[PDB]
Design a protein around this ligand. Structure first.
Ligand SMILES: N[C@H](CP(=O)(O)O)C(=O)O
Ligand SMILES: N[C@H](CP(=O)(O)O)C(=O)O
Lengths: 222, 222
């Protein structure tokens, strides 16, 4: 491990996944759970197997029903269902402290992630997810469809944005699934993370895969 | 005119447009006023006339220009700019007691046009106005593009979709601009209006061009 190594503090940027990595809960499956469409949606996932369906349709569909009112995502935020995965709040601090711009990247919703941000004392400007839309009524209107993460494989389209513009050079992506990982070729280094989720197909092909956000404290100190 | 005008007592269902027919000022220009686009929006609508480009196109621009937030549109119905015309309330109130159907077909936003519908006591479902989308953070995000009132000749779409639906014998349209008039053929009959706004087009060209419900309420109160 010494290899890491402050491998990490040789970085100017460290982009984090929120769902399943920055936090134990997913961000979409929760919205549905608070909508009485809980097992209705969790039943929508088994067939993407095939994935036919691409990411935009996929989400435009599972979302095409939830029909998350503004209210409802408000009740969600109010209930604070999101629970951070245990050494993030402090890990993000030890980073931005040493003078590193922490970022958050999700296929989830800016409504939720933003709140997640404040609790990591992460800037608001440093967040990237789908922007949910509502009618005056507060009914589900869809969602921003130009946002980098509304299309398949747009997770990296952003990580190479953050560089195109602020010119970081040497940024890390902490993520749990192969979408987070596939972003490494566009981004400098990928640290897998299973928490909560082991997702074998990353724990097998990925270099540098931690079990928990604590494993990286002892080495971080020394 | 041949007076007393069986026009109205025979009637099954009458419907009027919202913007300076049943109300004093227009929602778009008034909304644009609290955004600083007043002069700019005002000048676009005026050029929008008898062969002007469709509705759907030009109201994408105007709104793209204004860019109204859930905070701006909600506080408007605070300043409640919408002013009912003199003889609108109890003209419709009159006809509503007799068991007829009254409707609001307007190329405005129900976000606003429904505050009007309320107390004229018209249902909420008897209002056809395109909706305005909004982000969770309350910012402009387009408008429902699937609504009849969102494109040109839209008014005659909801009307002809109103007879097949509820099945009426005497549907009467009442508007101020030729637009609201282009729908007469689908509807049984049309009555103009120049109380707030003038525009010859319709003044000298239709049957029973009433100016001001006051000036037709007299023979109506008959
Ligand atoms: N891309 C997701 C992460 P998220 O659902 O936060 O977008 C994964 O592959 O696990
Ligand atoms: N299209 C509007 C009518 P409304 O504002 O009711 O949509 C006009 O005649 O100028």
């Amino acid at each position: 491990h010494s290899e890491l190594r402050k491998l990490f503090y040789s970085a100017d940027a460290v982009c984090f996944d929120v769902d399943s990595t920055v936090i134990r809960e997913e961000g979409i499956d929760e919205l549905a759970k608070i909508c009485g469409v809980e097992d209705a949606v969790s039943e929508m996932t088994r067939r993407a197997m095939g994935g036919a369906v691409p990411f935009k349709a996929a989400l435009t569909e599972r979302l095409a029903l939830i029909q998350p009112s503004r209210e409802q995502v408000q009740r969600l935020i109010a209930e604070q269902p999101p629970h951070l995965t245990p050494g993030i709040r402090e890990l993000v601090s030890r980073l931005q402290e040493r003078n590193v711009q922490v970022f958050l990247i999700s296929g989830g919703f800016r409504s939720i992630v933003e709140h997640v941000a404040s609790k990591l004392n992460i800037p608001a400007t440093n967040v990237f997810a789908n922007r949910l839309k509502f009618y005056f009524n507060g009914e589900y209107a869809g969602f921003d469809e130009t946002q980098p993460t509304a299309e398949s494989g747009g997770k990296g389209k952003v990580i190479k944005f953050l560089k195109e513009k602020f010119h970081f050079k040497k940024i890390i992506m902490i993520g749990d699934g192969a979408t987070d990982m596939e972003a490494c070729p566009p981004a400098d280094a990928f640290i897998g993370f299973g928490g909560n989720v082991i997702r074998q197909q990353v724990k097998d092909n990925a270099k540098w895969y931690i079990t928990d956000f604590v494993e990286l404290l002892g080495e971080l100190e020394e």
